[PDB]
Amino acid sequence: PKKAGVLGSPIAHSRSPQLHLAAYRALGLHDWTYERIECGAAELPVVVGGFGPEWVGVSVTMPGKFAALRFADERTARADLVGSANTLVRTPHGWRADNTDIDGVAGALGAAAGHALVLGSGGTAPAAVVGLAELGVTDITVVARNSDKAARLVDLGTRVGVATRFCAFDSGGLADAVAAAEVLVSTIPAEVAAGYAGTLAAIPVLLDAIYDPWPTPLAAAVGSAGGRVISGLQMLLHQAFAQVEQFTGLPAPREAMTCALAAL
Numbered sequence: 001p002k003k004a005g006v007l008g009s010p011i012a013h014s015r016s017p018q019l020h021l022a023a024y025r026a027l028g029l030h031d032w033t034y035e036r037i038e039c040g041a042a043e044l045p046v047v048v049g050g051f052g053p054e055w056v057g058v059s060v061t062m063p064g065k066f067a068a069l070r071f072a073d074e075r076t077a078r079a080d081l082v083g084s085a086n087t088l089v090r091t092p093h094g095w096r097a098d099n100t101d102i103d104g105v106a107g108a109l110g111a112a113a114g115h116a117l118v119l120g121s122g123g124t125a126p127a128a129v130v131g132l133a134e135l136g137v138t139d140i141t142v143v144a145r146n147s148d149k150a151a152r153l154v155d156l157g158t159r160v161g162v163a164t165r166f167c168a169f170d171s172g173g174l175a176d177a178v179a180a181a182e183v184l185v186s187t188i189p190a191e192v193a194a195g196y197a198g199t200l201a202a203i204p205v206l207l208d209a210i211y212d213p214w215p216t217p218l219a220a221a222v223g224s225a226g227g228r229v230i231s232g233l234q235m236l237l238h239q240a241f242a243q244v245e246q247f248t249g250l251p252a253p254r255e256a257m258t259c260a261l262a263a264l
């Protein structure tokens, strides 16, 4: 019997356990556990360092993804690329960090086209840029309140080979930018995105990182316009696949986990 779980703060509303435990059950690992652990960035090394032998790995959500990357002694190329880690996996002599949020975005969208818009400069925005690139997006516009963080974002886009640019939230380029874009990935609070819903509504595809509560005003706006709408639950589903494979050494049982998600 092995142990995994999810670290973050707050953590009470994580739907990670539902996904992972459904996977372990489908895989015949009926005796494995997965627990929610209240844990801020400073406490991450306390918790992970205290893990007994039977811990195979842990998921890490806000606010500890930067601490997780630094705590690990090995990091995947992609974890380095986005600058944070949502996944710690025990190895012979320590921990390996990875970032599966990239899979979260690429897998949730399933397929992307040419032009994308990313709302927000932090959180899962870097993963969204890399995932969009993975899908064959040639062009990305970063709409964000923090011009400095957004500068680092365009740089990453530039580095993964995507024509990438910045646009201020109230500069007046939002209509233009929405017009050229096929896909919108929003990583900002629903409360913040809400006021721009009218302008963003015409995007053909929305990926909203938010999942609770649902629908966000943005999702409702896009939905009413007939755009394809994908919630953060779909993101959660797809980032979890690679975590299950790394924790168990077995293919993610996607159907079982998709069923578990429908229950959510």
Ligand SMILES: O=C(O)C1=C[C@@H](O)[C@H](O)[C@H](O)C1
Binding pocket: 006, 014, 015, 016, 059, 060, 061, 062, 086, 087, 101, 236, 239
């Ligand atoms: O349980 C959750 O809500 C999450 C699990 C993390 O691995 C994901 O990266 C995301 O941050 C959320």
